[PDB]
């Protein structure tokens, strides 16, 4: 038996425009990046760099 749960909420309108968000590793971690211009969805990269 499935019963839809229905919630009524206020309906304000808001300005809505995506802002770039960067992700950063926490202390103890680092992010490796693949720098190949021809990179596949998976597999090895020979040009690899480290970023925070």
């Amino acid at each position: 038996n499935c019963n839809t749960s229905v919630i009524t909420q206020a309906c304000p309108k808001v300005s809505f425009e995506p802002i770039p968000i960067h992700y950063c590793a926490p202390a103890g971690f680092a992010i490796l990046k693949c720098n190949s211009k021809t990179f596949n969805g998976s597999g090895p990269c020979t040009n690899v760099s480290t970023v925070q």
Partner: antibody
Amino acid sequence: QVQLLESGAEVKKPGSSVKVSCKASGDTFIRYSFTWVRQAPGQGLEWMGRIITILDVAHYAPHLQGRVTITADKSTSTVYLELRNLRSDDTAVYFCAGVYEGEADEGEYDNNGFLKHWGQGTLVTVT
Amino acid sequence: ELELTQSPATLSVSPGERATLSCRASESVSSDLAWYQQKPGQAPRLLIYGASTRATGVPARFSGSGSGAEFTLTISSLQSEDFAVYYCQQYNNWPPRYTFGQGTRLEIKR
């Protein structure tokens, strides 16, 4: 284009319950919303609630919800009102109304708060 | 919640008169107000919605306007045909706790 056909009159002993209904005709039931009102017997009107048929969702007036259920069965194009724990205070003419919505089927529902299509009125009293 | 007050309980009119039926809201609304005609034994026909827009089938005699909490329905060249109890309805609510005024009757004096 929307016809509303009300159910007949009824009388119930206080503490009991009544269920009344409206049949929609000439249009697609799921296409648009319906509401219920209570017309007091020689007094003004009370909004009772609203039912959305595209979403099976309903809202009620704040002093009625412990007693009122508004539902619908789209397969018979019928809107239903059920009241429990009745009092003589609830003697009134009850009825449906509808408002055409912008193609709810396509998800272009307006949620209009005013009503255009009105039923005849069904008197419910107590005994 | 919302409450609406009709200023006249009964408006003093005569045929050809300009009816002026005001309605005061307990709180502000912008366009989400409508007017209806309750004739004895009849359905409360919709006249005006959106504060000023007339519904299809409504005579040109019926018009109105308002903002905030102050709205008026007027009837140009009032006919005996228009002697309905007029109700003011306010719906700028979500959840939709919609409300009604007490109703104004028109009466021809004599």
